[PDB]
Design a protein around this motif. Structure first.
Motif, PDB file in Angstrom:
ATOM      1  N   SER B  53       0.816  -1.210   0.000  1.00  0.00           N
ATOM      2  CA  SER B  53       0.000   0.000   0.000  1.00  0.00           C
ATOM      3  C   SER B  53       0.857   1.271   0.000  1.00  0.00           C
ATOM      4  N   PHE B  54       2.115   1.163   0.431  1.00  0.00           N
ATOM      5  CA  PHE B  54       2.949   2.361   0.538  1.00  0.00           C
ATOM      6  C   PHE B  54       4.013   2.505  -0.550  1.00  0.00           C
ATOM      7  N   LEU B  82      -2.973   7.038   5.267  1.00  0.00           N
ATOM      8  CA  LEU B  82      -3.591   5.799   5.682  1.00  0.00           C
ATOM      9  C   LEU B  82      -3.559   5.609   7.194  1.00  0.00           C
ATOM     10  N   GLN B  84      -1.068   5.186   9.258  1.00  0.00           N
ATOM     11  CA  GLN B  84      -0.212   4.054   9.604  1.00  0.00           C
ATOM     12  C   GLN B  84       1.143   4.463  10.157  1.00  0.00           C
ATOM     13  N   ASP B 166      -0.451 -10.443  11.172  1.00  0.00           N
ATOM     14  CA  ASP B 166      -0.727 -10.527   9.730  1.00  0.00           C
ATOM     15  C   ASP B 166      -0.262 -11.833   9.104  1.00  0.00           C
ATOM     16  N   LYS B 168      -0.306 -14.928   6.932  1.00  0.00           N
ATOM     17  CA  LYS B 168      -0.957 -15.372   5.688  1.00  0.00           C
ATOM     18  C   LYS B 168       0.148 -15.827   4.734  1.00  0.00           C
ATOM     19  N   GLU B 170       0.914 -14.909   1.882  1.00  0.00           N
ATOM     20  CA  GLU B 170       1.474 -13.735   1.213  1.00  0.00           C
ATOM     21  C   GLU B 170       2.692 -13.189   1.958  1.00  0.00           C
ATOM     22  N   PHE B 187       1.981  -4.775  11.022  1.00  0.00           N
ATOM     23  CA  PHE B 187       1.037  -4.722  12.149  1.00  0.00           C
ATOM     24  C   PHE B 187       1.580  -5.294  13.447  1.00  0.00           C
ATOM     25  N   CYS B 199      -7.138  -4.527  12.498  1.00  0.00           N
ATOM     26  CA  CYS B 199      -6.133  -4.711  11.446  1.00  0.00           C
ATOM     27  C   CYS B 199      -5.893  -6.195  11.209  1.00  0.00           C
ATOM     28  N   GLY B 200      -5.256  -6.508  10.085  1.00  0.00           N
ATOM     29  CA  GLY B 200      -5.053  -7.878   9.632  1.00  0.00           C
ATOM     30  C   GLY B 200      -5.601  -8.038   8.223  1.00  0.00           C
ATOM     31  N   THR B 201      -5.861  -9.276   7.837  1.00  0.00           N
ATOM     32  CA  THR B 201      -6.379  -9.591   6.508  1.00  0.00           C
ATOM     33  C   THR B 201      -7.680 -10.372   6.745  1.00  0.00           C
ATOM     34  N   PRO B 202      -8.767 -10.013   6.037  1.00  0.00           N
ATOM     35  CA  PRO B 202     -10.115 -10.523   6.381  1.00  0.00           C
ATOM     36  C   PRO B 202     -10.226 -12.046   6.646  1.00  0.00           C
TER      37      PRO B 202
END
Ligand SMILES: Nc1nc(Nc2ccc(S(N)(=O)=O)cc2)nn1C(=O)c1c(F)cccc1F
Lengths: 20, 345
Positions: B53-54, B82, B84, B166, B168, B170, B187, B199-202
């Protein structure tokens, strides 16, 4: 099949974090 | 075994002594963070490896040594937009301080008028995500090999009062030896007691996060459940086209397993994907030992894993095979942006 359902979904690519 | 998980002393004391020394090492760096240890012009930029994102993460070569790294570029203005800033400060302060075989090293960091730069240990095997999607799913022994490394990594991080937040595929890289390296500390947070950030991934969020409840390191153990499931099934335990649909599934209390999952695998996952915090493995009296001593891990020699002595189930082919990106030159503004906000970076 659940696999086929997943492969056809829009969420099989890299998944972004939620920054709220 | 449940009796084995609630046991001392010799082997448990060896783990304790290791973790005590590890904390001592971590606290020194935590209190006195490495800062401004390189400059952009010391690195030849080769190609983009991925995007966040950055900004881009670039394959780079350190000119004076010829060593290769992955350089994460973060546009300061984008971080601010954002909201962050504090998470980015956490990310760099924590990552420069930790040391564990399955954690990506932050080798250098620095900033200029426009950007923050995090120069990371390069993993030639790329992301687990890429391999998992291509292959479809991993066998249980394959998944177990990776899962074991995550278990030890979380035992390490949690002992330092860190939550990762976070997990995952990825964010998991595969090295030259087929072992894992956890990337992306965006995170990660050092906190004693509870925290509240959504925060995190859904797909990986624990119910308590979604429900705005206050949470702790048990969210990482839930995420391990999701990861193990996804590695073994080829798809996550909760998926849908939209995040809101995913959340409804997570909080429902219901999970379905593929018919090929072993009974031991299912038992472990029921204990990790447990909505009730007083019952979730990793969050009980026996802590991580409930996981380490579970039937599914019976064949796992934890010390051998830590020492990288186990033969990896998979070594990525090395040579051409990289994902292609459209490249653009880095423009560094002539004016310092967000200097105060990022002063400690
Ligand atoms: N440290 C690190 N090493 C790599 N290696 C790597 C090798 C090949 C490829 S690919 N699919 O062929 O373009 C991608 C990465 N990544 N990396 C990172 O921090 C990193 C990450 F975590 C996620 C995404 C991108 C990254 F860059």
């Amino acid at each position: 099949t659940t696999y086929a359902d997943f492969i056809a979904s829009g969420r099989t690519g890299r998944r972004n974090a939620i920054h709220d | 075994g449940n009796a084995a998980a609630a046991k001392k002393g010799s082997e448990q004391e060896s783990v304790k002594e290791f973790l005590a020394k590890a904390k001592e090492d971590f606290l020194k760096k935590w209190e006195s963070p490495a800062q401004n240890t390189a400059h952009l012009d010391q690195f030849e930029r080769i190609r983009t490896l991925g995007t966040g994102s950055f900004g881009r993460v670039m394959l780079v070569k350190h000119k004076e040594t010829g060593n290769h790294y992955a350089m994460k570029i973060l546009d300061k203005q984008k971080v601010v937009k954002l909201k962050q800033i504090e998470h980015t400060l956490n990310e760099k302060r924590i990552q420069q301080a930790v040391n564990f075989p399955f954690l990506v090293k932050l080798e250098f960091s620095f900033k200029d008028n426009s950007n923050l730069y995090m120069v990371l240990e390069y993993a030639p095997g790329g992301e687990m995500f890429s391999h998992l999607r291509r292959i479809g799913r991993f066998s249980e022994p394959h998944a177990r090999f990776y899962a074991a490394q995550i278990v030890l990594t979380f035992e390490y991080l949690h002992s330092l009062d860190l939550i990762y937040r976070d997990l995952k595929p990825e964010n998991l890289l595969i090295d030259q030896q087929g072992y894992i390296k956890v990337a992306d500390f965006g995170f990660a947070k050092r906190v004693k007691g509870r925290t509240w950030t959504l925060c995190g991934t859904p797909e990986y969020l624990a119910p308590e996060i979604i429900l705005s409840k206050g949470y702790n390191k048990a969210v990482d153990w839930w995420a391990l459940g999701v990861l193990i499931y996804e590695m073994a099934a080829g798809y996550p335990p909760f998926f849908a086209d939209q995040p809101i649909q995913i959340y409804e599934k997570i909080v429902s209390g219901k999970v379905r397993f593929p018919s090929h999952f072993s009974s031991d695998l299912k038992d472990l996952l029921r204990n990790l994907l447990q909505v009730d915090l007083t019952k979730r493995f990793g969050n009980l009296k026996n802590g991580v030992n409930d996981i380490k001593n579970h039937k599914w891990f019976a064949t796992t020699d934890w010390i051998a894993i830590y020492q990288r002595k186990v033969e990896a189930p998979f070594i990525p082919k090395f040579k051409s095979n990289f994902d292609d990106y459209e490249e653009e030159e880095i423009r560094v503004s002539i004016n310092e942006k967000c200097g105060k906000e990022f002063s400690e970076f």
